[PDB]
Each structure stands twice: as C-alpha cells, then as structure tokens.
Amino acid sequence: MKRTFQPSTLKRARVHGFRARMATKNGRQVLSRRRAKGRKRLTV
Amino acid sequence: AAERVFKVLLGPHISEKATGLADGKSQFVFKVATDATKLEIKKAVESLFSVKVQRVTTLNVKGKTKRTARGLGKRNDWKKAYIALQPGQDLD
Amino acid sequence: IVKCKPTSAGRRFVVKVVNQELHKGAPYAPLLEKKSKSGGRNNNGRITTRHIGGGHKQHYRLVDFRRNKDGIPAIVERVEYDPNRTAHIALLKYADGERRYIIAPKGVAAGDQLISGIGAPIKAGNSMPLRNIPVGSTVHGIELKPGKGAQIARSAGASAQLVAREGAYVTLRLRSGEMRKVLAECRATLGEVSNSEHSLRSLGKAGATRWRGVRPTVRGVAMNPVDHPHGGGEGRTSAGRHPVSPWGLQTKGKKTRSNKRTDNMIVRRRK
RNA sequence: GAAAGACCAAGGGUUCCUGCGCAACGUUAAUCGACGCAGGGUUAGUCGGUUCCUAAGGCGAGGCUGAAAAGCGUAGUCGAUGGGAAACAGGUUAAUAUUCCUGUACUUCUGGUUACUGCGAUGGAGGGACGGAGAAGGCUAGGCCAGCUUGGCGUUGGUUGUCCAAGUUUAAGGUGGUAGGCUGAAAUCUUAGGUAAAUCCGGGGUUUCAAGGCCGAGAGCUGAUGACGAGUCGUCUAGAUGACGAAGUGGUUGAUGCCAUGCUUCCAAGAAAAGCUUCUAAGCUUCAGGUAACCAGGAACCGUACCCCAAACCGACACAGGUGGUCGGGUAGAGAAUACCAAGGCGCUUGAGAGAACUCGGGUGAAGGAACUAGGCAAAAUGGCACCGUAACUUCGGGAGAAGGUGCGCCGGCUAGGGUGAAGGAUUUACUCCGUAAGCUCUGGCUGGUCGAAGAUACCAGGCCGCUGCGACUGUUUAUUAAAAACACAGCACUCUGCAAACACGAAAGUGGACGUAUAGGGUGUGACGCCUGCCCGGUGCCGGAAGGUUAAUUGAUG
Numbered sequence: 001m002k003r004t005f006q007p008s009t010l011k012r013a014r015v016h017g018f019r020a021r022m023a024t025k026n027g028r029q030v031l032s033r034r035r036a037k038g039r040k041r042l043t044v
Numbered sequence: 045a046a047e048r049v050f051k052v053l054l055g056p057h058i059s060e061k062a063t064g065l066a067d068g069k070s071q072f073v074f075k076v077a078t079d080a081t082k083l084e085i086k087k088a089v090e091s092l093f094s095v096k097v098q099r100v101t102t103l104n105v106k107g108k109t110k111r112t113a114r115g116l117g118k119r120n121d122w123k124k125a126y127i128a129l130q131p132g133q134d135l136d
Numbered sequence: 137i138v139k140c141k142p143t144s145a146g147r148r149f150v151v152k153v154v155n156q157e158l159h160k161g162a163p164y165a166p167l168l169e170k171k172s173k174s175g176g177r178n179n180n181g182r183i184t185t186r187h188i189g190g191g192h193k194q195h196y197r198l199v200d201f202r203r204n205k206d207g208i209p210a211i212v213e214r215v216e217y218d219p220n221r222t223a224h225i226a227l228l229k230y231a232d233g234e235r236r237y238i239i240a241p242k243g244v245a246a247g248d249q250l251i252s253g254i255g256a257p258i259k260a261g262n263s264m265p266l267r268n269i270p271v272g273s274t275v276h277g278i279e280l281k282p283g284k285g286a287q288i289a290r291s292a293g294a295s296a297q298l299v300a301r302e303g304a305y306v307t308l309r310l311r312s313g314e315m316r317k318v319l320a321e322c323r324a325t326l327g328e329v330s331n332s333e334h335s336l337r338s339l340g341k342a343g344a345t346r347w348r349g350v351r352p353t354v355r356g357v358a359m360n361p362v363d364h365p366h367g368g369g370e371g372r373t374s375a376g377r378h379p380v381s382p383w384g385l386q387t388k389g390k391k392t393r394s395n396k397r398t399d400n401m402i403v404r405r406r407k
Numbered sequence: 408g409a410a411a412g413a414c415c416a417a418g419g420g421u422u423c424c425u426g427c428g429c430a431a432c433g434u435u436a437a438u439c440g441a442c443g444c445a446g447g448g449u450u451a452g453u454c455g456g457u458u459c460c461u462a463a464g465g466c467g468a469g470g471c472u473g474a475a476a477a478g479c480g481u482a483g484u485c486g487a488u489g490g491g492a493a494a495c496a497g498g499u500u501a502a503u504a505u506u507c508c509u510g511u512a513c514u515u516c517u518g519g520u521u522a523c524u525g526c527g528a529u530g531g532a533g534g535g536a537c538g539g540a541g542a543a544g545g546c547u548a549g550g551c552c553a554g555c556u557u558g559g560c561g562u563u564g565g566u567u568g569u570c571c572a573a574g575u576u577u578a579a580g581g582u583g584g585u586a587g588g589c590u591g592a593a594a595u596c597u598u599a600g601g602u603a604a605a606u607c608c609g610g611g612g613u614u615u616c617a618a619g620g621c622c623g624a625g626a627g628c629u630g631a632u633g634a635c636g637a638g639u640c641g642u643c644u645a646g647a648u649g650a651c652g653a654a655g656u657g658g659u660u661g662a663u664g665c666c667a668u669g670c671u672u673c674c675a676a677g678a679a680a681a682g683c684u685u686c687u688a689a690g691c692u693u694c695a696g697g698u699a700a701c702c703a704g705g706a707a708c709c710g711u712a713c714c715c716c717a718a719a720c721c722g723a724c725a726c727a728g729g730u731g732g733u734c735g736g737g738u739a740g741a742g743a744a745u746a747c748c749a750a751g752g753c754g755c756u757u758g759a760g761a762g763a764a765c766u767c768g769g770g771u772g773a774a775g776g777a778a779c780u781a782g783g784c785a786a787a788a789u790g791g792c793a794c795c796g797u798a799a800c801u802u803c804g805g806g807a808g809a810a811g812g813u814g815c816g817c818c819g820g821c822u823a824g825g826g827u828g829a830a831g832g833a834u835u836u837a838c839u840c841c842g843u844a845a846g847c848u849c850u851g852g853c854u855g856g857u858c859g860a861a862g863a864u865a866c867c868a869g870g871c872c873g874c875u876g877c878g879a880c881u882g883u884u885u886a887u888u889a890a891a892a893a894c895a896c897a898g899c900a901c902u903c904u905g906c907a908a909a910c911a912c913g914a915a916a917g918u919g920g921a922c923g924u925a926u927a928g929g930g931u932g933u934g935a936c937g938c939c940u941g942c943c944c945g946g947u948g949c950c951g952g953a954a955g956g957u958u959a960a961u962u963g964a965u966g
Binding site for chain 4: 141142143144145146147149150152154161163170171172174175177178179181182185186187188191193194198199205207208216217218219220221223230232233277280286287288289292293294310311312313314318331333335337339341342343344347348349353354355358366374375378379380385386388389391392393394395397398401402405
Binding site: 068100124 | 420421425443446447448449450451500501502503506507508705707708709710711712
C-alpha cells in the first residue's frame with residue numbers, strides 16, 4: 001500500500017531548497033515571510 | 045606557513061584500539077584539526093615529534109547527538125588520523 | 137508488398153511493404169544527428185498537438201533539400217530507409233568525395249545524376265531550375281524560395297506536374313489538385329518520389345500505430361460536456377450540435393485558410 | 408531456505424560495539440532490548456562520489472518580446488539514471504576492512520639526467536558508439552562421482568569393509584594469442600571535398616601478392632618449494648595463543664556467466680559529448696615542445712559504523728502492507744513452480760488451562776445427487792507426459808489440450824546407439840588430426856517376473872459439452888462499491904490545410920505541428936471481415952453566386 005511521500009534528498013533540495021527559493025521572486029518572498037515570522041529553519 | 049604546524053595536531057586519541065595499535069603496529073592515532081590534509085599532518089609529525097612518517101590515513105568522525113530538555117544537542121564533528129611510522133621509532 | 141498469414145489475431149490484416157533494394161543497416165554516420173521526441177508538447181510544456189507519444193528512437197538524417205553542388209556528378213551509392221519520412225533516401229557520392237543524402241526518385245538504383253543549370257532533363261533525379269525544364273514534365277521537391285530548399289511534393293510517391301511558364305514565374309499542378317504559381321528561378325528535381333507503394337500498407341493492429349509515435353484518438357462524443365462540445369448525453373448520443381473541433385471551430389466543411397499574403401500565388405484552389 | 412539467506416542503491420542518521428542500568432518506552436514480566444547513562448568504533452591512487460564529458464531538462468552575457476513582475480532564447484555552463492585510469496588473495500576484532508597487516512600486482516601524474524628529434528588548437532577526420540528477436544557452438548564457475556588423506560569400528564541383528572564421516576583449497580595479475588569474429592594488403596601518382604591548411608580522412612588512376620592485420624574467451628605455465636588446511640605438539644587460564652601442520656588428484660555434467668558491443672534475421676531503423684588515435688592552423692627562433700630509456704618521488708578532498716524480502720526507509724505504531732538492483736547449493740522436478748533439506752537464519756514479546764453454545768479456517772461423511780439458490784454462489788471435480796483418436800463451423804491460421812481412450816511403480820533378461828576420452832599412425836613438427844579401449848555420462852527398443860485397494864500414489868497440476876445476446880480480436884478505465892456490452896483499436900469515410908500550413912499554447916516574442924510537406928498534417932464520425940450502406944436540401948450549418956434591397960463608424964448638403 002504505497003504512500004504519498006517517497007523520500008529523495010535531491011528532489012527535496014531541487015523543489016524546496018534554498019537556491020530554488022532564491023531563484024524566483026515569489027520564493028524570495030517566501031524566505032522573507034518565513035524569516036519575518038522568525039522561523040528557525042526557513043528551508044525545509 | 046611558519047604557523048599551522050602547531051595548529052593541525054590536536055592530541056593523541058587515547059583508546060583501547062589506539063593503545064593496542066600503537067603497541068602492535070607502529071601506528072599512533074592523533075586527533076587532528078578538522079580541515080587537515082594528509083600531507084600537512086605528515087610534515088607536522090615530522091616537524092614536531094622528530095620521526096619519519098611513512099603513511100597517514102584519515103577519517104572524519106560525526107559528533108554524537110544527545111537528547112535532553114530543550115531538544116537534541118550535537119557534539120562537534122571531529123577528525124582522526126592514523127600515523128604509520130617505521131617499525132622502531134615510537135613518538136614522544 | 138506482402139500479406140501476412142493469420143497465425144495470430146494481430147497478423148491477420150498486416151500488409152507489409154518490403155523492398156530488398158533498401159540497404160541492410162548502418163546508415164552513413166556523418167549525415168546523422170540526434171533527434172529526441174516532443175510528446176506533442178511546447179516550450180511551455182503544454183500539449184499543442186494531440187495524439188503524439190512514444191515510438192521508436194530515430195536519428196535525423198541530414199537530407200539535402202537544396203542540391204547546391206552544380207556541375208559535380210554524383211553517383212548513387214545506395215538507397216536507405218529513413219524513419220522520419222515516408223520516402224526513401226539515396227546516398228550520393230559526388231565526384232569529389234562528398235557524400236550527401238537526397239530524396240530518392242523512382243529508379244532508385246546505383247545510377248548517376250548531376251544537379252546543375254543545364255543537364256539531362258530526361259533523367260529522373262537531375263535537379264534543375266524551373267526555367268530550363270520542359271512543360272509537362274513531372275517534378276518533385278520544389279523550392280518556394282530560392283535557396284530555401286525543397287518544400288512541395290516530397291512525400292512518398294508524390295510529384296507535381298509543370299503546366300505553364302510565363303514571365304518570371306511558372307505554374308505547376310500539385311498533388312492536391314490546386315494550381316500554384318511558383319517562381320521560375322527556384323528549383324525542382326525531375327521525376328517522382330520513390331516509395332510510391334507506401335499507401336498500400338495496412339498497419340494491422342492497434343500497436344503498429346503506437347510504435348509510430350501516435351497516441352490513441354478519443355472521440356468527442358465519448359466525453360463529457362466539460363471536455364468537448366460533443367460532450368455528454370444519456371446513452372449514445374450523436375453530438376446534437378453541428379460537428380466541431382474540441383476548441384469550437386466547425387469541422388465539416390468550413391474553410392480555414394486566412395493567409396491573404398500569398399493569394400496571388402495560388403491561381404486555382406483544390407477543385 | 409529464489410528466503411524468514413547473504414549483499415548494493417535510496418531513505419534514515421549512531422540505531423553499531425562494550426561497560427553500567429530498568430523509572431518511562433517494549434501491548435505481559437524482564438536480569439533482555441533498536442530503551443536510559445558513559446565510553447569506544449567508520450582508515451582507500453584502485454570500491455563509491457568530487458574532479459573530466461555530455462542527455463532530457465534548467466539557467467542564460469548580450470539579444471528579441473512584454474503595463475511592471477517577467478517570458479523565450481544565442482554564446483555559454485550546469486545537469487546522470489549514461490560515457491572517461493587501475494587490486495586481488497590471505498590474516499586480523501568487541502565494533503572497520505577490495506580501506507588496516509602480509510604477499511603479489513596495476514593505473515596515472517610530477518621532478519630529474521641520456522640520445523636522436525617537428526611541436527602545436529576546442530579546428531578537420533577517426534573512434535567512443537550502442538535496436539528488438541532468435542540461435543548454434545566453444546568454454547568457465549558451480550555440481551556430482553572416483554581416487555587420496557585423517558579420524559572411526561558403532562548403546563539393539565550386522566558393520567576390517569566392495570563400510571562410515573570430514574577434508575580433498577589457492578585470487579588478481581604476468582606469459583601465452585587458442586576455439587572463434589571482422590577484414591583485401593603494400594607502394595606510387597593525382598585531387599572541384601572535410602567552411603584556412605593538412606603528410607590525416609574522403610575521391611580517381613597505376614603496379615605486385617595471397618596472408619597481411621585487428622580483436623578474442625578459455626586451457627597450459629607462472630603467480631605459489633607461498634597462503635589456506637583436518638588436526639598434532641607445547642604454554643597458561645571447558646577454551647585463548649606460539650610453533651609444526653596430512654591429502655591437496657582424476658573423470659563426467661555444466662550454466663541465466665564469458666567469448667559476445669560476435670553471428671543470423673526483422674522493421675518499428677535503434678543517445679550525445681569527452682577521454683583516446685590522428686591531421687595541420689596561428690605561432691615557435693625552430694633551445695621550448697614531443698618520443699623512448701633510466702632514476703627518484705607522488706596520487707588531494709569527501710563517504711565508509713549500522714538497518715534494506717526492514718522494529719532503523721515510506722505506512723501516527725516494534726503496523727499481515729509497500730520498496731529499485733545483485734548472488735543463488737542438494738534430491739525429486741521442465742522450472743528460479745513445488746516438497747523436503749545445505750550454507751545461513753529463525754520460534755513471529757502475553758501466557759496457563761478447559762475442550763459448552765456460537766464463530767472462524769479445515770477433515771471425513773450413510774442414502775439421495777442441485778430437490779439449494781435470484782443464480783451450481785461456495786464447494787466437490789478435472790489436472791502430467793508419451794501414444795491413439797477428435798465434430799459442427801472456418802477468415803484455411805484455426806477450432807483443438809475439442810470430445811474420448813490406453814500405458815505409467817519396482818526388479819531382472821536380451822539388445823541399438825550418442826557424447827567425452829585415447830594406445831598408437833600421419834607432418835605444416837604441436838593449444839593437431841585420425842582413430843583405438845576402459846572409465847564416466849545421456850537416450851532408447853523388446854520381452855519377462857513382482858508388490859500393493861491404488862504406480863503422473865505426496866506437493867504440484869485444464870472440468871467439459873450444446874444453443875444464443877453483445878463487442879471483431881491483444882489492450883484500457885471509475886486509486887477506495889461498477890472491468891463491462893463502456894473507451895481504445897486496425898480498417899473506413901467526410902472535411903480542413905500549398906508551408907511563415909490548417910491547428911494549439913502563448914497580451915507578444917516564440918514554440919509545438921516538423922527540421923515533416925497532400926501517400927503529409929489537424930479535426931470529426933464510424934469501428935476487423937463479408938454483403939451492403941435506401942429516400943429527403945424545407946429548418947439549421949457549410950460551400951459557391953450575382954448583384955437588387957437593407958445596413959456601421961466616417962462624411963457634413965440643407966433646414
């Protein structure tokens with residue numbers, strides 16, 4: 001019974017990583033929201 | 045550098061495995077600085093302990109993670125060299 | 137042309153076009169380049185043509201459509217199969233090294249031709265300007281712009297018939313039955329394209345389509361009203377609308393040529 | 408026991424090991440633990456990654472385009488799931504080992520000295536470099552048997568034997584260039600080509616000859632009078648260690664491994680780029696650079712513990728689930744099915760009783776044999792191999808394993824071969840032929856006898872037939888109540904589209920269609936095949952046609 005999260009660190013870092021977020025305008029403002037909320041991680 | 049000979053070697057790692065290995069072979073296990081290539085911890089042993097080194101092998105060690113209140117804390121990842129010498133010639 | 141025997145239920149209607157003058161393997165490797173499939177998809181990644189997908193990996197063959205080399209005689213080395221055409225391709229060794237692929241005419245074999253400004257207009261395979269070919273002679277691979285290369289009448293067993301010369305232009309009748317004013321400086325090859333029995337073959341089974349890179353075709357009436365205007369209905373319905381594209385253009389008769397830049401070049405439509 | 412075994416990737420992140428512990432966690436208890444505390448453990452030129460190269464795709468100087476944000480893209484430069492150097496055996500432990508130790512290699516780089524010396528690019532050629540299927544063959548691992556070594560002599564008949572048990576190992580690499588695969592070879596002259604050149608490749612002409620050449624397993628020898636080895640001896644605390652350490656050979660069967668990126672065949676026509684080989688250009692002062700020899704030296708960084716048919720990953724769980732790839736012994740067997748087992752692993756973390764109804768998963772069942780029921784649902788049955796036989800209908804392939812029937816175990820008697828093998832005879836004198844023989848192994852054919860109720864004796868393993876509806880068939884679908892008659896489909900027809908195509912996605916640039924071109928491409932309906940596919944152009948659409956009425960912005964006469 002295959003589930004919906006099948007982990008891969010490469011697909012992790014390329015969809016949601018730091019450089020993927022800082023490549024686009026909207027991901028840069030994801031990081032500025034998530035830094036304005038004061039979060040410890042901000043890249044998950 | 046004239047420095048960096050005194051910064052790479054961080055002390056002899058003391059353990060049962062290091063002791064039996066220093067007795068049986070001529071290999072001495074040093075804790076070394078976490079960015080130290082194999083030849084700058086070969087020149088440092090040849091400079092400071094006055095021996096002839098024939099080989100250095102290295103290994104990064106992950107620091108262990110301890111659980112307590114306020115979460116997991118990690119110890120420092122450290123570095124570890126095995127210094128093979130000529131079969132006499134034990135360093136001090 | 138061979139007909140397969142019904143030893144299984146899929147071979148019963150396979151009619152197979154077989155040519156033993158075609159060359160057994162190993163295409164001429166300096167005239168091949170890499171070609172990867174699209175899936176019918178855009179640079180937006182969107183499907184912009186339905187029903188493309190899969191198929192066999194194919195190299196693109198650098199077919200010469202221009203026949204630049206004037207006055208250099210080229211013998212025909214061999215005739216090969218081309219995955220990305222319906223015609224066959226002939227490999228031409230020019231008189232100074234220089235191997236090139238062209239579209240093969242009828243009479244495919246190891247003979248000779250020389251694309252030039254004047255030479256041998258009864259040899260199917262010689263390429264000429266349309267000025268100095270006779271009127272009534274069948275041609276193929278016609279340029280529309282001088283130096284653009286062949287564009288018209290180059291599928292398997294296709295040709296145009298040159299019907300009238302006047303001025304700087306020349307009229308030729310296309311396979312679609314429409315008369316086209318084409319320039320007289322632009323070129324054509326004498327003859328008729330090779331694999332003219334291509335239209336006799338029957339695929340035979342559902343999966344001979346899929347290994348051409350053609351994905352299945354689902355009809356409009358099989359869908360829901362959200363998906364197609366032919367859409368829903370209880371039971372089998374008939375698309376109670378007038379028949380229509382999935383994007384709402386009418387299908388069965390409505391003209392869609394709206395160029396208007398090139399209408400003077402077309403002196404008679406398909407009639 | 409084709410895993411409940413060993414292993415690699417991913418994912419995890421110390422769960423690994425050892426001391427001390429048992430509160431909590433563990434569906435019970437726990438002295439145990441994947442749990443708590445504290446220590447330790449992960450060693451590389453060769454295994455993986457980085458580094459070199461590129462695919463899909465991404466990003467993209469400038470650039471085109473877009474209210475802005477941005478989109479697309481050229482040069483470029485990222486991007487492996489692919490391509491580019493090379494290590495194997497034996498020891499060693501608490502836990503690492505192709506990493507440490509020992510022995511034996513291999514690859515590549517750097518600095519030297521010697522000698523003769525055309526060096527040089529991203530640029531040109533070459534190569535790398537490749538599909539599906541199907542087979543001969545030749546080997547090898549492995550298996551088995553025999554011999555040989557060591558031990559044994561059987562708690563109840565027998566067991567000094569033609570008996571039993573165990574062991575009978577040895578790698579990479581060097582040398583060899585074999586079975587076998589592909590192949591014309593050399594010299595010379597010339598040249599509108601490979602966007603400059605070229606001694607390279609391509610093209611053309613001339614002369615000589617038949618064997619060159621390039622690959623390529625495996626056997627042999629060497630690695631190796633070494634390591635491993637049942638065990639003996641000795642020391643000390645039932646075992647830890649030092650030295651010594653027997654036999655270590657022959658025959659057969661052999662792969663899904665290797666030759667083999669080979670060969671045959673078919674259409675659906677089967678990655679790029681670099682490393683590598685070669686050619687010159689721009690230049691050098693033709694010292695530099697190249698090419699061999701010899702000598703000395705080097706090969707950085709990162710990952711390595713542990714789990715992967717999982718209690719460590721993904722499922723809120725120590726969850727009957729899921730999770731890519733690799734190996735694969737015996738006997739029966741077609742088989743990797745299955746059954747019993749080997750190496751190896753395990754007793755699935757609540758048990759003890761008891762032996763009611765009922766419930767579940769099974770076993771047998773008198774006499775009936777579908778009376779059950781919506782319906783033979785379930786069950787019961789059939790089940791193999793060889794031989795015999797087999798209907799309608801049929802598109803001539805089928806139907807068909809139709810239907811049905813016979814033989815089957817064991818032990819002998821007589822008898823036909825096959826394959827390995829070789830005593831010796833040939834000469835091109837050796838990895839060669841011919842061909843005796845045993846031994847080993849593989850199939851028969853015919854007759855007997857014999858035991859049981861029963862011989863494909865277990866597991867395993869088709870039930871079949873007769874009318875019809877529907878859909879031609881294989882395929883697909885409502886993840887999680889519908890697998891179908893639904894969708895798809897080959898085939899058919901209509902209609903559009905002349906290329907800057909119709910068409911689609913995009914305020915656009917652009918891109919797909921397509922590096923295709925009317926035998927092509929889009930849309931639509933029908934759905935193999937056979938016979939066919941009738942009437943109607945009023946409505947509505949579509950196509951064409953005059954040119955009369957109407958008719959918009961804009962004009963701006965006149966009142």
